[PDB]
Design a protein around this ligand. Structure first.
Ligand SMILES: COc1nc2ccc(Br)cc2cc1[C@@H](c1ccccc1)[C@@](O)(CCN(C)C)c1cccc2ccccc12
Lengths: 53, 38, 105, 41, 223, 75, 77, 45, 74, 75, 75, 75
């Protein structure tokens, strides 16, 4: 039940994400932690493998 | 050849360095490519 | 905040429409136009804009520019959109999937 | 004169110190050339 | 009178050559948003396609210059393209500016090949499968050419934008002379000026890509 | 004046070096025609070599126009 | 074509004599603005507009200047 | 890389049409005999 | 702001500081950028109007040279 | 007299640089024959590269007639 | 008087040896295009030879440009 | 003097022979790309033919630079 009241609270977050047209790259990171660049592994621009780019 | 008139060289060197190294790069550090999601 | 959807409606890519409407009332439709021909013919008569070799290098780089815009404009016009309605869809898609991975869970 | 640190040097900090360190060693070579060229003129 | 478009421009006694060198970055707006306008959508795409070109061939230490060698092809390709406008003073026709973009990026490239990894940089002067008995001659080439690479860059770009503007300005003066003479000839000298302007547009970009590729290839041979 | 007359001979002789780069652009844009009829799927990567070969050969011709104009005008 | 001619037939035509009275009427309007100072009443919005239309009509004197000499670029002799 | 290879075909499909073309140009004295000595009968499940 | 004022005091009313006129450019830039460039479906005329105001400047300082090439003298 | 004479020695010696554009146009239209005999389906894609390689030869051929002009007329 | 006039002709002739490098760099990058289209899986190793060839042909042309100046400026 | 004058046109035109070794090093290192794109398993034997062709073509370049530095300083 704990692991469910969490998810339903988690899911409503991604159910109410700002329309992407108003979204900032600093907002896309708190929503999808998958997209935040690894400023620690790659300190210099473009902060990611050029192949991945 | 007016390129050889060395009296106006420091007028071309310093505003270049202030652009190639500080103003153009600063505008590149603002161009970021976020990783794609799942 | 959301961006608007259109710019300033500029005519001939050089003079914005805020100018023609600004002079339309007192001088009419052909008001600003005859000012143009009135200034150009004055400029190159009193040798303000002196015809030089650069005159024919101006028309060329203005001819190639006005032809590259008319021939490759619409292609870049939408290509800049398809890069968005792809990046937009690529998000909304994963966004919904990211629910399945939490709805099934 | 703030945000000249934050907007103008905080971003360029990892580059102006570590990555472009040898650039400046070359930029000193260049300044020696420019003055010398202007010295013999 | 002929090299007039290359003398340092001054208006009202003010050295206007600074408001011209600092302008290219004004045509590259930026935004923190996720879905912006057509300009920054096309530009952020070009910077993506460009950086994936110059930088993919590098190792991890060479990719720390991925801000320099991209913010350099963007500054030379925008200074040249802003030179094709009428009467414009393009500061890439200046041996001063070009020598200031060439020497640091070069010196800062061989220094890191001499301040570190030097024992490996000592092996580019002697190619791999080289027999010995004529080495005391090859040492001259790989050094004297190294000592003249920084002047190859700044002059390959100066003499290509200068001569490109001089030609367009002469062929332009031709059409002006044959204007008051047989006119169906003016239209054939003019259409040569149009094919020449389409060439000077391409060489405006090519001379930016080659400059920032030869600085890249020097870097790749020192990291 | 023999000094100002000798400028026109050197300047006119210096610009002969443009014959070289005028012959190396035909090799590059001739090799592109050959190399593109053998692997027409590489059309974009070959043309990205015809460009580097164009600018690096043509550059050697302008080094002769440099001395053609360093002599003729700037002594 | 015909569109430029369709608009010309109204304002690119010689004036009527009936408009001369009201023309000098406005002439007396702006001169009284010069006597007491009604030019101080003008906000910059239409202030420049009256200036441009003045440069507008001024160029008529110059396009007429070049037709009085049958030459475009300066004086032929 | 020929045009058909860019068009998706394979050399087997290229050879099936070139050989069909030769037989289609054979004379009737040989066309009947040559078509049955090389005709196909196999079928895919 | 001007386009609705009428007084010569406005010329002296303004903040003529090294930081003053900069804020008149930075606000004059964002008023242009937001109008023609920073809109979805914007057109090229947001740029071909900057270059047109960059030629007039590239010609203004280059007039001291072209005057020596007039084909008349009056 | 020598100044106006030293120009024909400099002008003629400057229109030699178009020799390189006579060999660059050979190698271009010489590879269109080799590249077309190899892939005769690209007859219209190759021919558009030959016209490109031919035009870029006049480009380096004009850089010479410029210095052959300046020496001759605009000394 | 003529000792300087000869330094404008001797330097205009020395600088035409660069034409040998405008045609060399074309042959090097006219072979990186042909050779690539045949074995496009060796792009990393062909380019590493086109650079060695571009540097060694240019190194000969720039010897001419150095004797052009070492005559025009040193002695 | 007319000796110190002509010894600059001589030593200035003798050094055009380097235009040969410019396009000889471009072909050797150009065909090495085509010889390697074909038989890359001979990379050690091919590159030993390129260095032989680079040292024998450039040696003809030095024989010209040797003469220009002979009619200048030697005698
Ligand atoms: C038609 O020929 C061309 N085709 C081109 C193709 C591409 C390009 Br980009 C430039 C081209 C330019 C030209 C000619 C041209 C014609 C008119 C004006 C200017 C240039 C040309 O330059 C020939 C160039 N060769 C010979 C070095 C020329 C120059 C001078 C005198 C000429 C006299 C007679 C004939 C041709 C003459």
């Amino acid at each position: 039940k704990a692991r469910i009241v969490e998810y339903e609270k988690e899911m409503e977050k991604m159910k109410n994400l700002i329309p992407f047209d108003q979204m900032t790259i600093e907002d896309l990171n708190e929503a999808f932690p998958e997209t935040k660049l690894d400023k620690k592994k790659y300190p210099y621009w473009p902060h990611q493998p050029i192949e991945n780019l | 050849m007016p390129q050889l008139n060395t009296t106006v060289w420091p007028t071309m060197i310093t505003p270049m360095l202030l652009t190639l190294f500080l103003i153009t790069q600063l505008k590149m550090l603002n161009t970021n490519y976020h990783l794609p999601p799942s | 905040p959301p961006l608007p959807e259109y710019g300033g409606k500029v005519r001939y890519g050089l003079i914005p429409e805020e100018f023609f409407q600004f002079l339309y009332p007192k001088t009419g439709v052909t008001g600003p136009y005859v000012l143009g021909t009135g200034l150009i013919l004055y400029a190159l008569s009193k040798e303000i804009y002196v015809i030089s070799a650069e005159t024919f290098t101006a028309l060329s780089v203005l001819g190639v520019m006005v032809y590259g815009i008319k021939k490759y404009g619409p292609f870049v016009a939408d290509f800049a959109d398809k890069l968005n309605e792809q990046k937009l869809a690529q998000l909304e898609e994963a966004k919904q999937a990211s629910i399945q991975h939490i709805q099934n869970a | 004169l703030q945000s000249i640190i934050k907007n103008i040097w905080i971003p360029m900090k990892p580059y102006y110190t570590k990555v472009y360190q040898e650039i400046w060693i070359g930029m000193g070579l260049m300044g020696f050339i420019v003055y010398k060229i202007r010295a013999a003129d | 009178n002929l090299f007039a478009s290359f003398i340092a421009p001054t208006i009202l006694g003010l050295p206007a050559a600074v408001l011209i060198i600092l302008f290219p970055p004004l045509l590259i707006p930026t935004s923190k948003y996720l879905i912006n306008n057509r300009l920054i959508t096309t530009q952020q795409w070009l910077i993506k396609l460009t950086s994936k070109q110059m930088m993919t061939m590098h190792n991890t230490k060479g990719r720390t210059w991925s801000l320099m060698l991209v913010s350099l092809i963007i500054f030379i390709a925008t200074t040249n393209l802003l030179g094709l406008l009428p009467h414009s003073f393009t500061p890439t026709t200046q041996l001063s500016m070009n020598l200031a973009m060439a020497i640091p990026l070069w010196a800062g490239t061989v220094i890191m090949g001499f301040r570190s990894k030097i024992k490996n940089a000592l092996a580019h002067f002697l190619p791999q499968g080289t027999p010995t008995p004529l080495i005391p001659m090859l040492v001259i080439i790989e050094t004297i050419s190294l000592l003249i690479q920084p002047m190859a860059l700044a002059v390959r770009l100066t003499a290509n934008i200068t001569a490109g503007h001089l030609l367009m300005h002469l062929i332009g003066s031709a059409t002006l002379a044959m204007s008051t003479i047989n006119l169906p000839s003016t239209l054939i000298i003019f259409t040569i000026l149009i094919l020449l302007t389409i060439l000077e547009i391409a060489v405006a970009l090519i001379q930016a890509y080659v400059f920032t590729l030869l600085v890249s290839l020097y870097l790749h041979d020192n990291t | 004046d023999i000094d100002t007359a000798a400028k026109f001979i050197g300047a006119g002789a210096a610009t002969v070096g443009v014959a070289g780069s005028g012959a190396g652009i035909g090799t590059v844009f001739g090799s592109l025609i050959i190399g593109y009829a053998r692997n027409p799927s590489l059309k974009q990567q070959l043309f990205s070599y015809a460009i580097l070969g164009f600018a690096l050969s043509e550059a050697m011709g302008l080094f002769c126009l440099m001395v053609a104009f360093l002599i003729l005008f700037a002594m | 074509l015909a569109t430029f001619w369709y608009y010309a037939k109204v304002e690119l035509v010689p004036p009527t004599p009936a408009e001369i009275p009201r023309a000098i009427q406005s002439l007396k309007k702006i001169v009284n603005s010069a006597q007491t100072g009604s030019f101080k009443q003008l906000t910059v919005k239409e202030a420049v507009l009256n200036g441009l239309v003045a440069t507008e009509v001024l160029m008529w004197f110059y396009v007429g200047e070049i037709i009085g000499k049958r030459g475009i670029i300066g004086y032929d002799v | 890389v020929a045009y058909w290879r860019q068009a998706g075909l394979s050399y087997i499909r290229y050879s099936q049409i070139c050989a069909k073309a030769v037989r289609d140009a054979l004379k009737t004295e040989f066309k009947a005999n040559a078509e049955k000595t090389s005709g196909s009968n196999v079928k895919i499940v | 702001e001007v386009k609705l004022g009428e007084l010569p005091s406005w010329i002296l009313m303004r903040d003529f500081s090294p930081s003053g006129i900069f804020g008149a450019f930075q606000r004059g830039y964002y008023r242009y950028y937001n109008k023609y460039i920073n809109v979805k479906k914007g057109s090229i005329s947001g740029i071909t109007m900057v270059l047109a105001c960059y030629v007039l400047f590239s010609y203004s300082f280059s007039y001291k040279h072209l005057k020596h090439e007039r084909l008349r003298k009056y």
